[PDB]
Amino acid sequence: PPPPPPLPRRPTRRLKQMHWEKLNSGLEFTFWTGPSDEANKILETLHTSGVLDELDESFAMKEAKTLTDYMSSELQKLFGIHFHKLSHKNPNEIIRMILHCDDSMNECVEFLSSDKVLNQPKLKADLEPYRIDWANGGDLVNSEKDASELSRWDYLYVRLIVDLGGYWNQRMNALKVKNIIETNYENLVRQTKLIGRAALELRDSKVFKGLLYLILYLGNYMNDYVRQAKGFAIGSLQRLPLIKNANNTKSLLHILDITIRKHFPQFDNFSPELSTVTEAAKLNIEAIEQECSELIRGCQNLQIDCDSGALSDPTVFHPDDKILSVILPWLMEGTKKMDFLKEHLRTMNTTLNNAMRYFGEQPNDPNSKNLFFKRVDSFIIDYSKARSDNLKSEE
Amino acid sequence: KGLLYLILYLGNYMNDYVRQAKGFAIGSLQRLPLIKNANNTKSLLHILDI
Amino acid sequence: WXAXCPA
Amino acid sequence: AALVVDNGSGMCKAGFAGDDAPRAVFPSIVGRPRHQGVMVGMGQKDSYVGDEAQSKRGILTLKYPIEHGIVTNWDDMEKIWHHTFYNELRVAPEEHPVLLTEAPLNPKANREKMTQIMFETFNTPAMYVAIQAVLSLYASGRTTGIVMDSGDGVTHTVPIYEGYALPHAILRLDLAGRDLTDYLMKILTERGYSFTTTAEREIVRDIKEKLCYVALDFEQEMATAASSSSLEKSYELPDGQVITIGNERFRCPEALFQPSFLGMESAGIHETTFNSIMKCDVDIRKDLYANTVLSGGTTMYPGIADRMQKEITALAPSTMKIKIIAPPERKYSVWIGGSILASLSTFQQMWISKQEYDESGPSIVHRKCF
Amino acid sequence: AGWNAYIDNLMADGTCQDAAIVGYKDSPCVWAAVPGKTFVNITPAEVGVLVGKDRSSFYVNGLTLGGQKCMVIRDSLLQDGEFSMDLRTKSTGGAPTFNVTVTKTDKTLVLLMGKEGVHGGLINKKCYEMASHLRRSQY
Numbered sequence: 014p015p016p017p018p019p020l021p022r023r024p025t026r027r028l029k030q031m032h033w034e035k036l037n038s039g040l041e042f043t044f045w046t047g048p049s050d051e052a053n054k055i056l057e058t059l060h061t062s063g064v065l066d067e068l069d070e071s072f073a074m075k076e077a078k079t080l081t082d083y084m085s086s087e088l089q090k091l092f093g094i095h096f097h098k099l100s101h102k103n104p105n106e107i108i109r110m111i112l113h114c115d116d117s118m119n120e121c122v123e124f125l126s127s128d129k130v131l132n133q134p135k136l137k138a139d140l141e142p143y144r145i146d147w148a149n150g151g152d153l154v155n156s157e158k159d160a161s162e163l164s165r166w167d168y169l170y171v172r173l174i175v176d177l178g179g180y181w182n183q184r185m186n187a188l189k190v191k192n193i194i195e196t197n198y199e200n201l202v203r204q205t206k207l208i209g210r211a212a213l214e215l216r217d218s219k220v221f222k223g224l225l226y227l228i229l230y231l232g233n234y235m236n237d238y239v240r241q242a243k244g245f246a247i248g249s250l251q252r253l254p255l256i257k258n259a260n261n262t263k264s265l266l267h268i269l270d271i272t273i274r275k276h277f278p279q280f281d282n283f284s285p286e287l288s289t290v291t292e293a294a295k296l297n298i299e300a301i302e303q304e305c306s307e308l309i310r311g312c313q314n315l316q317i318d319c320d321s322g323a324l325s326d327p328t329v330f331h332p333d334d335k336i337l338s339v340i341l342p343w344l345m346e347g348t349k350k351m352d353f354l355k356e357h358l359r360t361m362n363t364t365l366n367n368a369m370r371y372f373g374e375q376p377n378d379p380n381s382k383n384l385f386f387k388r389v390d391s392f393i394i395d396y397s398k399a400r401s402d403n404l405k406s407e408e
Numbered sequence: 409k410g411l412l413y414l415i416l417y418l419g420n421y422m423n424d425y426v427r428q429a430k431g432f433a434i435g436s437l438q439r440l441p442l443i444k445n446a447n448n449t450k451s452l453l454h455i456l457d458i
Numbered sequence: 459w460x461a462x463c464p465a
Numbered sequence: 466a467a468l469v470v471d472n473g474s475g476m477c478k479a480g481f482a483g484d485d486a487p488r489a490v491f492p493s494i495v496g497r498p499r500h501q502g503v504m505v506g507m508g509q510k511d512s513y514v515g516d517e518a519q520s521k522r523g524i525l526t527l528k529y530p531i532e533h534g535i536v537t538n539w540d541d542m543e544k545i546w547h548h549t550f551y552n553e554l555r556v557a558p559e560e561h562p563v564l565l566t567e568a569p570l571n572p573k574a575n576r577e578k579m580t581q582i583m584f585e586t587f588n589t590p591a592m593y594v595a596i597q598a599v600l601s602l603y604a605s606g607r608t609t610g611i612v613m614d615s616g617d618g619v620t621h622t623v624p625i626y627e628g629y630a631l632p633h634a635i636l637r638l639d640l641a642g643r644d645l646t647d648y649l650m651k652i653l654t655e656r657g658y659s660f661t662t663t664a665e666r667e668i669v670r671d672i673k674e675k676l677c678y679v680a681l682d683f684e685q686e687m688a689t690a691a692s693s694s695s696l697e698k699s700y701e702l703p704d705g706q707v708i709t710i711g712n713e714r715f716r717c718p719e720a721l722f723q724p725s726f727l728g729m730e731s732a733g734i735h736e737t738t739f740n741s742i743m744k745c746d747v748d749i750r751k752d753l754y755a756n757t758v759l760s761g762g763t764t765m766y767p768g769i770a771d772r773m774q775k776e777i778t779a780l781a782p783s784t785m786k787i788k789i790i791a792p793p794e795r796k797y798s799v800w801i802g803g804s805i806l807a808s809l810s811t812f813q814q815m816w817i818s819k820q821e822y823d824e825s826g827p828s829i830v831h832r833k834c835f
Numbered sequence: 836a837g838w839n840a841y842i843d844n845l846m847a848d849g850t851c852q853d854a855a856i857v858g859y860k861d862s863p864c865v866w867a868a869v870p871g872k873t874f875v876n877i878t879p880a881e882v883g884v885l886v887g888k889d890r891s892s893f894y895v896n897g898l899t900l901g902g903q904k905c906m907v908i909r910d911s912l913l914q915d916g917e918f919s920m921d922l923r924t925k926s927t928g929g930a931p932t933f934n935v936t937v938t939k940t941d942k943t944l945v946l947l948m949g950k951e952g953v954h955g956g957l958i959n960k961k962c963y964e965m966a967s968h969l970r971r972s973q974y
């Protein structure tokens with residue numbers, strides 16, 4: 014590398030500063046360089062005119078009126094954002110209501126549940142001497158370590174994160190699972206009922222069976238003798254729009270609409286008859302199954318925690334900590350919810366499966382398990398546009 | 409040019425010693441209206457006309 | 459008009 | 466106590482740091498009488514702004530100082546601020562720092578222009594300027610996401626990330642509330658109601674705020690609207706006249722999703738939301754979809770949240786999940802987020818002082834508060 | 836004198852954990868950097884991306900700087916007045932991310948990435964200052 018360069022008349026009172034952009038580069042070619050006597054007489058005129066004196070009186074500025082935190086600079090920003098509702102309350106007041114697991118801070122508890130607040134090794138060492146050994150004795154680890162010297166948010170972090178960190182992650186788990194279950198069990202039962210009903214309706218629909226037989230019988234007519242199969246999969250229904258006649262005006266499915274209407278009045282309109290399939294095509298089977306399966310894993314993980322985990326020990330619990338007094342009442346009812354959902358989960362799986370073999374496809378292919386109603390729905394809309402175009406053109 | 413020389417001398421007396429430049433761009437005229445007196449009644453341009 | 463002017 | 470002042474195209478919001486609601490919420494209008502005064506001795510003012518201007522709007526020529534985000538008149542803009550501090554808030558600015566907001570992709574011309582008029586006319590001790598879009602998700606309690614910012618003047622889509630704006634990813638769409646109000650009147654004349662002047666422009670603004678709503682399916686709703694009179698509602702004009710609209714309730718708000726109804730080549734916010742997120746990085750794209758937020762008074766229409774959720778879902782890949790966050794308080798989210806930001810203890814670090822400005826000049830704002 | 840002494844000047848306040856200087860003319864190479872850190876491993880190919888004519892490709896998936904993945908915030912290197920760049924490191928599994936700034940001089944590129952929790956504005960203002968000083972020295 015090349016050698017490096019060195020390292021880095023007047024008014025009686027201060028008045029308003031008028032800033033400017035200066036001259037571009039220098040006054041190499043500007044008229045400012047020219048010291049015309051026209052400008053010289055201006056300087057003597059102003060020194061004689063009573064203008065500068067008035068300037069001191071009128072444009073004097075109004076003076077200026079300008080007016081041990083271990084916690085990281087970024088983090089004070091985050092704490093004030095979420096606990097804004099409690100600004101008027103002292104740290105002793107806000108440290109108490111949070112342990113009540115009240116409804117008023119079901120949102121703020123999620124913020125302290127983030128990895129950002131927990132993953133702060135340097136502060137945990139700094140606030141460690143200020144921690145109170147609440148697990149045994151309930152006394153300060155060091156001698157004096159006054160907590161009044163700490164700032165407003167410093168008191169909260171040491172008394173909540175450092176002090177209760179032994180069961181903090183366990184307690185938040187009991188509360189994070191608390192919120193998710195309270196709102197999803199109602200909808201999850203609705204989703205699994207629709208899929209099971211849709212699968213049963215498709216399996217128990219003669220209209221859907223009848224059109225497939227008509228397509229198969231028509232399909233075997235134009236096909237060769239060596240390829241006269243007696244069955245086909247649902248995914249093969251997409252070849253109909255891809256076949257065009259001599260002038261490309263009318264596709265294969267377009268003949269079917271007028272053929273059915275003229276001779277098969279029973280198959281004229283099957284979309285109103287089978288509607289739950291279309292709504293079932295807007296839901297992901299694997300995603301729904303995984304979402305429900307997540308609930309059971311959290312529930313069984315909770316049972317070993319409340320009965321034999323960190324929650325089991327009450328000695329490390331503060332007397333004003335009703336977390337044990339709130340989870341246990343739900344513990345019996347929560348077991349009922351997981352049993353019902355488990356039954357519904359099994360109900361959907363078998364109800365989808367018996368209708369799954371019934372049409373020749375298998376769930377072993379993950380796409381086939383997911384994209385089962387989509388292919389049927391794809392044919393439903395394809396038949397809909399084919400009928401609409403056929404009616405519009407002829408009428 | 410006389411107008412430009414007039415305001416520059418006023419500004420040089422008006423400003424600090426460390427920023428006593430001898431020239432400015434034409435686009436610098438825009439801060440005359442936005443500088444007011446104690447009661448905001450008159451500006452540098454208003455007193456300039458007098 | 460109905461709401462506005464005379465028409 | 467630090468003032469938090471929210472200048473807006475339609476509404477101006479002001480209050481104090483830590484407060485949960487703006488103290489003064491008044492229209493951002495300036496009025497000048499178009500008729501000579503014959504009754505002397507009243508001390509009638511020369512210019513009228515805010516609620517008082519709205520009260521006597523019939524004999525005034527209302528003007529919006531800010532149009533399409535850019536301030537078209539710097540002389541009126543201070544007057545509403547002058548009325549903001551001494552009249553509405555009744556507080557002297559000489560002893561309180563003040564907070565103002567700035568618009569995405571703002572030209573550099575304005576940014577010192579507000580700076581050069583506050584430290585001089587009102588000589589506020591301290592100042593800070595941030596994006597209204599950034600403060601939107603701050604009130605929502607999140608730091609990373611994309612905001613569906615729509616208001617009276619302009620609309621912006623800002624995919625924020627740790628509170629730091631992405632300039633290249635900012636998309637600007639000219640489909641604002643004033644456009645819809647202008648679109649509401651041109652379609653309201655079909656029913657024999659002719660509103661043309663600016664004073665009655667507020668009237669239709671009142672009508673759409675109460676009666677207009679977002680329909681889930683346009684094609685289904687026009688068929689039902691033509692068939693039945695159930696969707697029709699009656700509104701009362703201040704003169705006592707009774708009006709009824711049949712299908713305009715869902716037609717005017719629909720232009721936000723079908724700009725070709727207004728004739729703009731740029732498409733609706735539903736794709737613009739999708740268009741903006743295409744510009745970001747692939748790895749971060751997962752977070753942005755699930756923390757989409759709505760903001761501004763334009764997004765107040767009933768049934769607007771599910772309609773946009775349905776449309777972008779088709780645009781989005783089937784693998785991805787979309788979570789439209791629409792807090793009911795998002796009307797004042799920009800103001801509330803600023804009060805949250807001002808109340809922070811660390812917020813004293815990036816103050817710009819009156820002294821420091823003096824040696825640094827107007828140019829300090831581009832580098833100090835960015 | 837002593838290209839390493841700037842790194843010491845860069846680390847006086849302790850707000851940053853990595854700092855480096857690289858000459859982007861001819862064959863890119865590091866002139867001084869913090870040993871054992873991110874900035875000491877800069878390749879010429881990464882320098883070419885930073886100073887390349889294409890100012891849009893690094894928006895699709897970010898770029899790598901010393902092999903560490905980072906995302907682009909704002910690009911103003913080739914614009915007169917600032918000659919500065921802003922980056923934020925990209926991490927996996929909730930690993931800490933840091934703000935990265937790069938300032939372009941006549942012959943050198945000054946790179947700063949701060950410690951955890953440090954605002955990018957503080958990192959940017961310093962790198963602009965030493966870059967401003969360094970250009971006044973005709974480098």
Ligand SMILES: Nc1ncnc2c1ncn2[C@@H]1O[C@H](COP(=O)(O)OP(=O)(O)O)[C@@H](O)[C@H]1O
Nearest residue numbers: 473474475476616617642673674761762763765
């Ligand atoms: N309930 C409502 N329904 C429909 N539009 C509304 C409603 N409330 C407010 N608005 C519209 O929102 C606008 C307010 O814009 P605003 O968000 O204050 O702009 P800015 O973000 O620039 O301050 C008004 O012009 C009004 O037309």
Ligand SMILES: [Mg+2]
Nearest residue numbers: 597615616761
């Ligand atoms: Mg807005």
